[PDB]
Amino acid sequence: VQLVESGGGLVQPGGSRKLSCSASGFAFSSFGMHWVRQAPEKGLEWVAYISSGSGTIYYADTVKGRFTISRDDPKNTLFLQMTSLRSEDTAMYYCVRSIYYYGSSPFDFWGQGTTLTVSSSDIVMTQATSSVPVTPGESVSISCRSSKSLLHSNGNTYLYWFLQRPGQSPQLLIYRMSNLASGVPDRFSGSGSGTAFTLTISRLEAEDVGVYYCMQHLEYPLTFGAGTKLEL
Amino acid sequence: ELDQLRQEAEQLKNQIRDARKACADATLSQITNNIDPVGRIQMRTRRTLRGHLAKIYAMHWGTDSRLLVSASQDGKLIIWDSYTTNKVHAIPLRSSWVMTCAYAPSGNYVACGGLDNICSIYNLKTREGNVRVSRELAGHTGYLSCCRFLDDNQIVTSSGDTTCALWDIETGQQTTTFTGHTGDVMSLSLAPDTRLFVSGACDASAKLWDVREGMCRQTFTGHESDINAICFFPNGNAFATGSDDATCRLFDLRADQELMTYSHDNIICGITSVSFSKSGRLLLAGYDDFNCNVWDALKADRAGVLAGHDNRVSCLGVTDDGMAVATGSWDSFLKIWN
Amino acid sequence: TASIAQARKLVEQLKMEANIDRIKVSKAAADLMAYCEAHAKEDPLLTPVPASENPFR
Amino acid sequence: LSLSTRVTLAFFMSLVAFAIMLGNALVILAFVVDKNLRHRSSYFFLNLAISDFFVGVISIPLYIPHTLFEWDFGKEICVFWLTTDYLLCTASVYNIVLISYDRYLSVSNAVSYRTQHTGVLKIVTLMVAVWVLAFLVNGPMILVSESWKDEGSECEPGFFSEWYILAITSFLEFVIPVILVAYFNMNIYWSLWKRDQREHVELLRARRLAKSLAILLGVFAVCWAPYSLFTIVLSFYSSATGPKSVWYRIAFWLQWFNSFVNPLLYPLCHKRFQKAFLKIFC
Amino acid sequence: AAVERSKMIDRNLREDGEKAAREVKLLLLGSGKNTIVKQMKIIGIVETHFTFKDLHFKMFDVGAQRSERKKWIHCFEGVTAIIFCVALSDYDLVMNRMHASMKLFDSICNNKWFTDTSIILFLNKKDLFEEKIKKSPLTICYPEYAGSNTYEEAAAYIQCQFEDLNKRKDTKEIYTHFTCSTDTKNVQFVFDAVTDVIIKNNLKDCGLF
Ligand SMILES: NCCc1c[nH]cn1
């Protein structure tokens, strides 16, 4: 599996750009694609979404009306045509693949991201801290809060945990608050009550350091937490 | 040495029949007559799964008690969300003629087979976002009539070539072959411990096998026609068969003899499928007369009727929690009852 | 020589299943009765369940 | 006329209207429910059932008080009644013509008929064209001729005063449909006959096919010829506008009787619709 | 999103049924089947797919099924027709071969799953039959017979004892064909006889018959 994007760079205000995301090695036509951005040293921010088959499209109001999410299934490409690029549009945009059936993991793979620079109701998710010093071998606990309850009548709690190691793209760890992703060590764990959530790491290792993110998928627009960084 | 050897066979068979009758103190209906009857069971159709365009031949619940597979001879193997009636997957098959399908108790694989003599294994947890074919088990010379996983690695199949086989899915070869039947083997049922299984065949006999050894431990007779269906009792000390002579029978493994018969004068059709409820108090049988009869398994009374299909009911299953019953039929519809 | 061999195998297997012991059906019939009374309460189909615990309403 | 006799006639006509509504309601219910009836013939049967149903719902219930109980239609109400009635009747005729054409295609080009891919858009286009032509034949002339009507309140279409308009309307709504239906039915019979102890079986089957096709054509013609010919003749003799005779009223009712009959012939004789009805009612 | 996935699956499932309803499903029984298969081979169970004059046919050969036909014969209910293959040149061979074909033909023709299904009869190997009929009499097979030695009369007698095995009359047709391996008309005959079946099916569905 491989999502590789392109189309980023430096642009002057008032212009327009088109980002691409070519997929390789998976059933692209069966996946809903998201665009997620992360401004320099600020945090994650969901941009938009296009369903499998191009049926549904969603935007974040911060960019709705200027962007558009388009899809080319035969060529296995996903685009983001952006117009009226302000300074706030400076960010690293990520291509994220999502698939929604019972039991799926809908944020499992992220692309590598592409840097875009521009020259000069919603559920609030808050992460208590921004840095947590610890040494290897010690159990750590991260926590974040929501405004609404993420617990649905289904019995599902739509909370997701990500991990962006230094210099890398985010990687999914927990989906729906208690389910470990594929290919992640079983030392991570997730638990919550509906508005108060936590992520416990037992036997912390050297490579488990980085900013942890807690995201809700209960409702659109998708909102990320502030971001808790583990220091060592 | 044929006539006297054969006479020894009859003498030992006569001795077996004497032993079974010797231990038969009282019939099950004499001691269970003190039980309160179940009364009346009215099960409403809660869901109707409608995506198949041909006859449905087999269905299997996932251990989740929420997912189930169905196989129709339209060439499709569909996985259902029985709570939201959503379609999780739709697997196209190389050969349209499928007579059986199974769900891995882990939930990562699905098996199906039929008139091509091959048991194909499908991976439901591929990283590329689709259901693939992971294995094609080809050792039978007759059609495949049933198959059930023991784990994610080994599976047991029955066939119309009169034999059952245990497979290693990683290598794709029969670890052991179970032989001794005379007609086609139509069904098999794994024990809860998954060390024994029973198989019913077209010679109107059911035989109990040891998975590790590969030998008949016991043989059960009494049906007058082909045994189409077979199921284990929840505690694994008994099993029930459904035959073409319009009867179902309960066989005990300890007593080595039948316990009671589930037959009605107004029923003159063959049984296509049988199942037990979570407590083993309800024997659910699918019939060729387009409806499923619920039987009081201890008193041999018909406690209810699931009359909701336009054609014969081909398959019948109960969830591992006992919450629901699913029935498939040649009318192309699966229905969930509660 | 093939027919006698098949019969020879039949007699050997048949003798093997004759040698096992059998338990009286009155005792083994009660075991099915006992298992049903023990697990009766947790059978949704036999004992109807309210529409709150029912995932199919 | 005596009040009791008028009440009896009103009850009978209301019963007829209820039957017309009910048969087509059953047809529409079967179509909507089965979902195995998404073939072209099923859609055409649905169109015909809709037309007959709305004949039952609107035309006859409005007719009963106007005639038997002397209720005075308003001018706009009379215009609405006339337009809807003529539209629905011509729509039923044209739906029958389309059904006959479909069966002729199925019998004459069976390979192309079977292998041809027909989307829902083309079927809906055919149905909409049927309705559009049903309107174009009558409504544009009824509305234009409303002015020609005298001061006296008469709810017959104005063009009844002119016989050539009646002749043209009858030609475009009766004669051409009848000729087309006859041609298609005869070609279906010829197909079977060319295809044809065993010779006795062939003879009996051909006789049954001829009987069925003749029944269909004869019912259509018997229902639609009397009133059309009566209207044309009376207009030619200038008697179309004025008092109506008993035979004229019976001829008037024959077309609504055809609307009643259509469900039992085309849908009810089709085995897929029969299976749908059996499933629904059992 | 998950509900939208189920609807996308319904779209493609229903699009597959439309494609699978435009194909002629043929059940091939029998003998000379391999001759018939190889004749229309334009493109456990052996399935042959071929196309002739805009029709897509699927032949299903069940010769290599040594099991109880009662168990899987109902799987083929719904086929357009059955192609039954018989070898004329096998009546003095061995109980009798020609009476084994007659026993099997009566089984399928009068089968309850095939009440409305037409049979396309292929009486094969007519070249070898006309040479053995002049060499050996037909009385070895049918003790009751008059036209002792003649291809035309002997073949007609055989063809009459296969269509007289049909107990359902006016419910289905039997389209008999005489065929040597060198014949180059077999596919056309199947297409011609299938077109007759389709047309009769359209008129029967409409209730016209
Ligand atoms: N088709 C003209 C209106 C009418 C006549 N009879 C019944 N309705």
JSON list of C-alpha atoms in Angstrom, two decimals, chain D residues 103-197:
[
{"chain": "D", "resi": 103, "resn": "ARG", "atom": "CA", "xyz": [-45.01, -8.43, -27.47]},
{"chain": "D", "resi": 104, "resn": "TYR", "atom": "CA", "xyz": [-44.59, -8.29, -31.25]},
{"chain": "D", "resi": 105, "resn": "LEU", "atom": "CA", "xyz": [-40.94, -7.35, -30.76]},
{"chain": "D", "resi": 106, "resn": "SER", "atom": "CA", "xyz": [-40.45, -10.17, -28.26]},
{"chain": "D", "resi": 107, "resn": "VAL", "atom": "CA", "xyz": [-41.87, -12.70, -30.71]},
{"chain": "D", "resi": 108, "resn": "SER", "atom": "CA", "xyz": [-40.29, -11.41, -33.95]},
{"chain": "D", "resi": 109, "resn": "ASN", "atom": "CA", "xyz": [-36.78, -10.44, -32.76]},
{"chain": "D", "resi": 110, "resn": "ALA", "atom": "CA", "xyz": [-36.48, -12.74, -29.77]},
{"chain": "D", "resi": 111, "resn": "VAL", "atom": "CA", "xyz": [-32.67, -12.78, -29.91]},
{"chain": "D", "resi": 112, "resn": "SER", "atom": "CA", "xyz": [-32.34, -8.99, -30.14]},
{"chain": "D", "resi": 113, "resn": "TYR", "atom": "CA", "xyz": [-35.17, -8.57, -27.63]},
{"chain": "D", "resi": 114, "resn": "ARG", "atom": "CA", "xyz": [-33.42, -10.80, -25.08]},
{"chain": "D", "resi": 115, "resn": "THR", "atom": "CA", "xyz": [-29.86, -9.52, -25.57]},
{"chain": "D", "resi": 116, "resn": "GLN", "atom": "CA", "xyz": [-30.85, -5.85, -25.88]},
{"chain": "D", "resi": 117, "resn": "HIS", "atom": "CA", "xyz": [-29.98, -3.67, -22.88]},
{"chain": "D", "resi": 118, "resn": "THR", "atom": "CA", "xyz": [-32.88, -1.35, -22.02]},
{"chain": "D", "resi": 119, "resn": "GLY", "atom": "CA", "xyz": [-32.31, 1.17, -19.26]},
{"chain": "D", "resi": 120, "resn": "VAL", "atom": "CA", "xyz": [-35.03, 2.68, -17.11]},
{"chain": "D", "resi": 121, "resn": "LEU", "atom": "CA", "xyz": [-34.58, 5.99, -18.93]},
{"chain": "D", "resi": 122, "resn": "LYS", "atom": "CA", "xyz": [-35.82, 4.61, -22.25]},
{"chain": "D", "resi": 123, "resn": "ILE", "atom": "CA", "xyz": [-38.82, 2.92, -20.60]},
{"chain": "D", "resi": 124, "resn": "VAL", "atom": "CA", "xyz": [-39.74, 6.16, -18.82]},
{"chain": "D", "resi": 125, "resn": "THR", "atom": "CA", "xyz": [-39.32, 8.00, -22.12]},
{"chain": "D", "resi": 126, "resn": "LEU", "atom": "CA", "xyz": [-41.77, 5.62, -23.79]},
{"chain": "D", "resi": 127, "resn": "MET", "atom": "CA", "xyz": [-44.29, 6.02, -20.96]},
{"chain": "D", "resi": 128, "resn": "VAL", "atom": "CA", "xyz": [-43.99, 9.82, -21.02]},
{"chain": "D", "resi": 129, "resn": "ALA", "atom": "CA", "xyz": [-44.39, 9.81, -24.81]},
{"chain": "D", "resi": 130, "resn": "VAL", "atom": "CA", "xyz": [-47.55, 7.74, -24.44]},
{"chain": "D", "resi": 131, "resn": "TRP", "atom": "CA", "xyz": [-49.00, 10.25, -21.97]},
{"chain": "D", "resi": 132, "resn": "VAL", "atom": "CA", "xyz": [-47.88, 13.23, -24.07]},
{"chain": "D", "resi": 133, "resn": "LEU", "atom": "CA", "xyz": [-49.54, 11.92, -27.23]},
{"chain": "D", "resi": 134, "resn": "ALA", "atom": "CA", "xyz": [-52.66, 11.02, -25.25]},
{"chain": "D", "resi": 135, "resn": "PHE", "atom": "CA", "xyz": [-52.84, 14.68, -24.23]},
{"chain": "D", "resi": 136, "resn": "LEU", "atom": "CA", "xyz": [-51.95, 16.08, -27.65]},
{"chain": "D", "resi": 137, "resn": "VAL", "atom": "CA", "xyz": [-54.73, 14.17, -29.41]},
{"chain": "D", "resi": 138, "resn": "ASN", "atom": "CA", "xyz": [-57.59, 15.59, -27.32]},
{"chain": "D", "resi": 139, "resn": "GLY", "atom": "CA", "xyz": [-56.73, 18.29, -24.78]},
{"chain": "D", "resi": 140, "resn": "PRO", "atom": "CA", "xyz": [-55.39, 20.96, -27.14]},
{"chain": "D", "resi": 141, "resn": "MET", "atom": "CA", "xyz": [-58.69, 20.77, -29.05]},
{"chain": "D", "resi": 142, "resn": "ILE", "atom": "CA", "xyz": [-60.98, 20.61, -26.00]},
{"chain": "D", "resi": 143, "resn": "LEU", "atom": "CA", "xyz": [-59.40, 23.76, -24.56]},
{"chain": "D", "resi": 144, "resn": "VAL", "atom": "CA", "xyz": [-59.53, 25.58, -27.90]},
{"chain": "D", "resi": 145, "resn": "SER", "atom": "CA", "xyz": [-63.15, 24.56, -28.55]},
{"chain": "D", "resi": 146, "resn": "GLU", "atom": "CA", "xyz": [-64.38, 25.55, -25.08]},
{"chain": "D", "resi": 147, "resn": "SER", "atom": "CA", "xyz": [-64.94, 29.03, -26.52]},
{"chain": "D", "resi": 148, "resn": "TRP", "atom": "CA", "xyz": [-67.15, 27.68, -29.32]},
{"chain": "D", "resi": 149, "resn": "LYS", "atom": "CA", "xyz": [-69.69, 26.41, -26.78]},
{"chain": "D", "resi": 150, "resn": "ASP", "atom": "CA", "xyz": [-72.96, 28.33, -26.68]},
{"chain": "D", "resi": 151, "resn": "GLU", "atom": "CA", "xyz": [-74.25, 30.20, -23.63]},
{"chain": "D", "resi": 152, "resn": "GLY", "atom": "CA", "xyz": [-76.24, 27.15, -22.56]},
{"chain": "D", "resi": 153, "resn": "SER", "atom": "CA", "xyz": [-74.42, 24.89, -20.12]},
{"chain": "D", "resi": 154, "resn": "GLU", "atom": "CA", "xyz": [-73.30, 21.75, -21.96]},
{"chain": "D", "resi": 155, "resn": "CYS", "atom": "CA", "xyz": [-70.34, 19.68, -20.77]},
{"chain": "D", "resi": 156, "resn": "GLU", "atom": "CA", "xyz": [-69.62, 17.97, -24.09]},
{"chain": "D", "resi": 157, "resn": "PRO", "atom": "CA", "xyz": [-66.42, 19.07, -25.84]},
{"chain": "D", "resi": 158, "resn": "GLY", "atom": "CA", "xyz": [-67.00, 22.00, -28.16]},
{"chain": "D", "resi": 159, "resn": "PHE", "atom": "CA", "xyz": [-65.61, 20.33, -31.28]},
{"chain": "D", "resi": 160, "resn": "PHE", "atom": "CA", "xyz": [-68.60, 17.97, -31.16]},
{"chain": "D", "resi": 161, "resn": "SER", "atom": "CA", "xyz": [-70.31, 20.68, -33.22]},
{"chain": "D", "resi": 162, "resn": "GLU", "atom": "CA", "xyz": [-67.86, 20.02, -36.09]},
{"chain": "D", "resi": 163, "resn": "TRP", "atom": "CA", "xyz": [-67.79, 16.51, -37.53]},
{"chain": "D", "resi": 164, "resn": "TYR", "atom": "CA", "xyz": [-64.37, 16.65, -39.22]},
{"chain": "D", "resi": 165, "resn": "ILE", "atom": "CA", "xyz": [-62.64, 17.34, -35.89]},
{"chain": "D", "resi": 166, "resn": "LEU", "atom": "CA", "xyz": [-64.42, 14.32, -34.44]},
{"chain": "D", "resi": 167, "resn": "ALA", "atom": "CA", "xyz": [-63.38, 12.20, -37.42]},
{"chain": "D", "resi": 168, "resn": "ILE", "atom": "CA", "xyz": [-59.73, 13.24, -37.06]},
{"chain": "D", "resi": 169, "resn": "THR", "atom": "CA", "xyz": [-59.72, 12.63, -33.31]},
{"chain": "D", "resi": 170, "resn": "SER", "atom": "CA", "xyz": [-61.32, 9.19, -33.72]},
{"chain": "D", "resi": 171, "resn": "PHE", "atom": "CA", "xyz": [-58.84, 8.32, -36.47]},
{"chain": "D", "resi": 172, "resn": "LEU", "atom": "CA", "xyz": [-55.85, 9.30, -34.33]},
{"chain": "D", "resi": 173, "resn": "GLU", "atom": "CA", "xyz": [-57.22, 7.60, -31.18]},
{"chain": "D", "resi": 174, "resn": "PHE", "atom": "CA", "xyz": [-59.23, 4.61, -32.46]},
{"chain": "D", "resi": 175, "resn": "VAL", "atom": "CA", "xyz": [-58.57, 3.61, -36.08]},
{"chain": "D", "resi": 176, "resn": "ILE", "atom": "CA", "xyz": [-54.77, 3.75, -36.06]},
{"chain": "D", "resi": 177, "resn": "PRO", "atom": "CA", "xyz": [-54.47, 2.02, -32.64]},
{"chain": "D", "resi": 178, "resn": "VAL", "atom": "CA", "xyz": [-56.85, -0.72, -33.80]},
{"chain": "D", "resi": 179, "resn": "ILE", "atom": "CA", "xyz": [-54.95, -1.27, -37.05]},
{"chain": "D", "resi": 180, "resn": "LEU", "atom": "CA", "xyz": [-51.63, -1.40, -35.19]},
{"chain": "D", "resi": 181, "resn": "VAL", "atom": "CA", "xyz": [-52.95, -3.83, -32.56]},
{"chain": "D", "resi": 182, "resn": "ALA", "atom": "CA", "xyz": [-54.44, -6.05, -35.27]},
{"chain": "D", "resi": 183, "resn": "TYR", "atom": "CA", "xyz": [-51.16, -6.04, -37.19]},
{"chain": "D", "resi": 184, "resn": "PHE", "atom": "CA", "xyz": [-49.10, -6.93, -34.11]},
{"chain": "D", "resi": 185, "resn": "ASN", "atom": "CA", "xyz": [-51.47, -9.68, -32.96]},
{"chain": "D", "resi": 186, "resn": "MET", "atom": "CA", "xyz": [-51.66, -11.17, -36.46]},
{"chain": "D", "resi": 187, "resn": "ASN", "atom": "CA", "xyz": [-47.87, -11.17, -36.70]},
{"chain": "D", "resi": 188, "resn": "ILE", "atom": "CA", "xyz": [-47.60, -12.92, -33.32]},
{"chain": "D", "resi": 189, "resn": "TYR", "atom": "CA", "xyz": [-50.03, -15.58, -34.50]},
{"chain": "D", "resi": 190, "resn": "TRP", "atom": "CA", "xyz": [-48.13, -15.94, -37.78]},
{"chain": "D", "resi": 191, "resn": "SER", "atom": "CA", "xyz": [-44.89, -16.38, -35.85]},
{"chain": "D", "resi": 192, "resn": "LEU", "atom": "CA", "xyz": [-46.35, -19.24, -33.83]},
{"chain": "D", "resi": 193, "resn": "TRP", "atom": "CA", "xyz": [-48.01, -20.77, -36.91]},
{"chain": "D", "resi": 194, "resn": "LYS", "atom": "CA", "xyz": [-44.79, -20.73, -38.94]},
{"chain": "D", "resi": 195, "resn": "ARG", "atom": "CA", "xyz": [-43.01, -22.24, -35.94]},
{"chain": "D", "resi": 196, "resn": "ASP", "atom": "CA", "xyz": [-45.60, -25.04, -35.91]},
{"chain": "D", "resi": 197, "resn": "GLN", "atom": "CA", "xyz": [-50.64, -36.68, -32.31]}
]
